[PDB]
Structure 1
């Protein structure tokens, strides 16, 4: 395999062994001032997501052209409020909301985004950006617009003095620092069968599988309750200490912990365990991300919840995650999705998670370091 674009980028080559730690190329001290040229009839446009009309344009572009499963049956349906939460964390910059519009009709046909993040990678803590929501309109595919978007966001991030990024993709590029598998836990088995998300278990029937995937009516961990403002410091402390055991992690400020974990309905849910002494010992969190059910006339929305960051110091992780499934069922989700990073593998069997198709690859840009097992990835991206 030959990568026309990625062979020119500061990333390790696919089959290369990596025994060192450090950047691929030195920091630049002079940056290209002019935006990269787009094909004729297209123009750059930084999207003001505070303008609800422009936010709806981005919602529409992603709702119609963003990530689909392998079988092309489901597509992510990021709500506009979710996109606001994901794209305006502390330190966001308007130029890093990088759209492409056709000049004649002003139609949004491309996008890519960067948000700042302090990243712990092995023994180094570096200021980086997280790249997400790279999208090219279906009617512009395979014309190498995606390399222009990547080079442009690189340029605009370089202008701010940042020379490394982290990103995830379902495809293999040079070169994954980690590779993870998807796991799903059924909550509404019938809907998952009728929409062909899962198939009837072999040597089983419909209402056999239902009471097999049944769970309690309310969680079992004593002291569980939704996160409040008074919990921001301890949630920050619990997260920082928990994440030290992994090799690729975010390093969040207390302001970033508030942004990413303070509950917002139909966006992010965080529950803390406050024990008999009044101490917050653990917390669980998951975010709301439905998928559009394509070419299906009856059921059109698949309501999914995604495991976010789950920290345990006193409640066993099995108890914590069981309660997360229970809370997700109570809130009307159809499935609970996660990736096998951190300690997520440890409760797959007992909590009856099923393995999904594909792989999630983790990448660093302009950083060369030995790869790591999925259990050492401690970074969850949206």
Structure 2
């Protein structure tokens, strides 16, 4: 595919060999003050997610027009409260919640977001942004609106003095820094087979499959408990030290650790291991993101838990993730999803995860560096 838009952007070309490390173009010392022109009848609007009505409008846009599987059976159902968690971390800016509205009706038909993040990439730490929730309403598709959204968020980020970004997508664009693969652990195999997320091996029965994926009723690790306020510093310490081994990671402040890990029901779960000495030595975490199930008579929503950050120093990772599955099961999740990044390959096959179809490509904007294997990627975006 010849990339009409992406060929114009400061990113390496697909199949460019990259032996260097650094920006593609210099920081811009003058920035376009005027928003990019949209097609006639549409206008920019910064979305105040503190206005419940506006948040609801965004919820609806994404609920109806965001990412679907290739067979149009599932669509992500990001909740309003989840969207607040994902889009208002420390340093969030209202101008980086970038909406497109119809002029006449004010209907929300487009969105893109940036949130700030300090990013470690090989031997460099840079203040960057993370781009997510790029969404164009189905009736506006293939009219070149996404490039305008990308240029406009780029402009708004440039105005704040930031010249690099990190982002992920299911599609191949110039040029991935790394490629990960989704893996899936059945928790409720009957429902997953009923809704055609999984399929029964012609070998096996339903009772056999349920027996195969059965988990204990309680976790095995000594002194596992939910994260509490007093754990914020040590969770930060554990995460900071653990992430140094990977080549692409966030560098979180203690306030960011609080934001991303402190438990919020139906959004983010974090459990810490406090040993017999009273020291916190490990933690596991996973976020809540259901998918709407289209066209099934009895089942309307697929409850999925997503592996977030799991830090081990004294508990074996295999055991940590076993307890993660048990906890997810207890809370009523149908499936536990995880990528093959960080050290996840050490446990996926052993804990009966099955490999999915979807790839997640990782990208940097305006940063040229060698690509890395999935096991060196240490960043998880919602």
- What is the CA–CA distance in structure 1 between the aligned matches of 2:279 and 2:69, rounded to whole Å? 42
What is the alpha-carbon distance in structure 2 between the residues aligned to residue 219 and residue 195 of structure 1? 28
Superposition TM-score, scaled by structure 2 size: 1.00
Alpha-carbon distance, 1:136 to partner = 0.2
Q: Distance in 1 between matches of 2:136 and 2:217?
A: 43
Unpaired segments ≥5 residues, structure 1: none
Deviation for aligned residue 1:315: 0.1
Structure 2 counterparts to residues 1-382 of structure 1, below 5 A:
1-382=1-382
TM-superposed CA distance for 1:274, in Å, is 0.0
CA offsets 1:82-122 (integer angstroms, 9 cap, x no match): 00000000000000000000011111000000000000000
Q: Give the TM-score normalised by the residue count of structure 1.
A: 1.00
Q: Please state how far the C-alpha of 1:359 moved relative to its aligned partner.
A: 0.7
Any idea what SS the aligned residue of 2:203 has? coil
1:71 positional shift: 1.6
1:296 positional shift: 1.9
Moved over 3 A (4+): none
Instruction: State the Cα RMSD in Å.
Output: 0.5
Q: 197-206 or 251-260: which moved more?
A: 197-206
Deviation of the 1:316 alpha carbon: 0.1
| Per-residue deviation, residues 121-141 of structure 1 (Å, max 9, x unmatched) | 000000000000000000000
**Distance between the aligned counterparts of 1:35 and 1:325, measured in 2?**
46
1:333 is paired with a residue of what secondary structure?
Answer: coil
CA deviation digits over 1:152-197, x for unaligned, max 9?
Answer: 0000000000000000000000000000000000000000011000
Q: Distance in 1 between matches of 2:135 and 2:204?
A: 41
Q: Structure 1 residue 33: deviation in Å?
A: 0.2
Structure-1 separation of matches of 2:284 and 2:368: 32
Q: Deviations over 1:235-293 (max 9, x none)?
A: 00000000000000000000000000000000000000000000000000000000000
Superposition deviation, residue 59 in structure 1: 0.3
**What are the superposed Cα offsets for residues 274-329 of structure 1, whole Å, 9 maximum, x if unpaired?**
00000000000000000000122321100000000000000000000000000000
Q: Give the secondary structure class of the aligned counterpart of 1:295.
A: coil
Equivalenced residues, count: 382
Looking at structure 1, the residues matched to 195 and 375 of structure 2 have their Cα atoms a distance apart, in angstroms, of: 32
Give the CA deviation at 1:201.
1.7
Cα distance in 2 between the residues matched to 1:337 and 1:51: 32
